[PDB]
């Protein structure tokens, strides 16, 4: 209907936004693991939204109320559920990495962002970064990028949850009384 | 008519219950294998004791093979008794470049 | 049976059990991955009733308060260094008084 | 010119993130889905 179409449009917009953000993450510097850039989750959301747009075109075109329609409506529902799960997982990963990165002091080196976490005793974890233009430039905008990306996947996951919830409420909330 | 689980749904429910039971049994077997192999008991790991203040206390004959001290690691004796180094029918050979100190037999 | 509210309680109970089982399986996998688990022991650290055993090196940070270092039956213990090898002793006041030192040349 | 110092504090954080977190989030999703379904599921009388 109209509401599923709006939800699919929001899904595609947010998927393209998060994929663009992940591509920018990768392009800034290859200092970050594949987990920390959730662009894979963005691509998954993008294919989800592509299937959604095809669904909401074919439903408005022809073959509206047959059995196979429901047979892959269930596929749409489960696919949106996995999209929501992957979005929440990306949120969790980004939150953990931001929490690690937000409570440490860093210094610049000749070619890398070598620095350590605050330590009670002189041995602790050390992090170095590829091709750092300045340790006060990448670190200082990375947190802003992370926060924006967090908001992006939070909204995407909420939209996915609502999309999953709407069709189920359509099916299992109203029971017919008269005949 | 009738209400409840009537047809194929009953079979699906029974299959799901059986599958969950199988998974639980597999998990229990894995945990029991862990307990048997590491000899975990009511008194602890039965070979180490992870103290709260980050201090391991081995309590059995330990064969560390090759030891590689790295930093702030000086081999020391226990609290106020001794430090006995013994060689079971083999010489004890210190070394520093070419300088030596070898306690052989005789 | 299982007509009404009984069904809507049984379904919730099964869902809760499934979630708990999934969490437990994750914890078990985490344990199996932190400890390099093998049928013989943790990684190369073979474990038996008599005691522990190793196969390879063993790095050590911070001091090592052993009781009595021994040596293998088939091999001679060979302490080594690059700068010096210092053996010390302490009086009742915990002060170094006598010490031997295998130095660079003497 | 050959300096070597070993203050590295290795810690197995990758395994924890790769293993515990996905199951925790899956369990949370299942719990919220079940609660929502129980609160819902025939709260509306479709008259006529």
């Amino acid at each position: 209907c109209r509401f599923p179409l709006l939800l699919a449009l929001l899904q595609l917009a947010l998927g393209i936004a998060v994929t663009v953000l992940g591509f920018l993450m990768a392009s800034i510097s290859p200092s970050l693991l594949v987990r920390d850039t959730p662009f894979w989750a963005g691509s998954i959301v993008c294919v989800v939204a592509y299937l959604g747009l095809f669904m909401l075109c074919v439903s408005y075109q022809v073959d509206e109320r047959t059995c196979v329609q429901f047979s892959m409506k269930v596929f749409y529902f489960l696919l949106s559920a996995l999209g929501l799960m992957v979005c929440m997982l990306a949120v969790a990963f980004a939150a953990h990495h931001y929490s690690l990165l937000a409570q440490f002091t860093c210094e610049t080196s000749l070619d890398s962002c070598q620095c350590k976490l605050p330590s009670s005793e002189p041995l602790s974890r050390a992090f170095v970064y590829r091709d750092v233009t300045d340790c006060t430039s990448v670190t200082g905008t990375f947190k802003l990028f992370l926060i924006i990306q967090m908001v992006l996947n939070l909204v995407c996951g909420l939209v996915c949850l609502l999309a999953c919830f709407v069709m189920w409420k359509h099916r299992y909330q109203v029971f017919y009384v008269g005949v | 008519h009738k209400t409840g689980l009537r047809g194929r749904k009953g079979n699906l429910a029974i299959c799901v219950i059986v599958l969950l039971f199988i998974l639980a049994v597999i998990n229990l077997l894995i945990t029991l294998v862990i307990w048997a192999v590491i000899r975990i008991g009511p008194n602890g790991c039965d070979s180490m004791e992870f103290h709260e203040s980050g201090l391991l206390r081995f309590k059995q004959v330990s064969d560390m093979g090759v030891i590689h001290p790295l930093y702030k690691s000086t081999v020391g004796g226990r609290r106020n008794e001794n430090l006995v180094i013994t060689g079971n029918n083999q010489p004890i050979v210190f070394q520093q470049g070419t300088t030596k100190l070898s306690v052989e037999k005789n | 049976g299982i007509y009404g509210w009984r069904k809507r309680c049984l379904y919730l109970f099964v869902l809760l059990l499934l979630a708990i089982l999934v969490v437990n399986l994750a914890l078990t996998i985490w344990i199996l991955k932190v400890m390099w688990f093998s049928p013989i022991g943790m990684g190369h650290l073979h474990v038996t009733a008599d005691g522990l055993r190793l196969e390879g090196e063993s790095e050590f940070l911070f001091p090592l308060y052993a009781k009595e270092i021994r040596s293998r039956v088939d091999s001679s213990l060979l302490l080594q260094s690059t700068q010096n090898v210092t053996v010390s002793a302490r009086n009742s006041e915990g002060e170094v008084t006598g010490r031997v030192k295998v130095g660079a040349q003497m | 010119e050959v300096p070597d110092r070993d203050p590295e504090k290795s810690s197995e954080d990758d395994v924890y993130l790769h293993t515990v977190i996905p199951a925790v989030v899956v369990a949370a999703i299942l719990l919220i889905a079940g609660i929502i379904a129980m609160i819902c599921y025939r709260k509306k009388r479709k008259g006529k």
Binding site: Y172, F175 | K2, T3, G4, L5, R6, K9 | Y3, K7, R8, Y11, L12, L15 | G34, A37, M38, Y41
Partner: peptide, 5 residues
């Protein structure tokens, strides 16, 4: 008797 949680 449409079954669900």
């Amino acid at each position: 008797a449409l079954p669900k949680m």
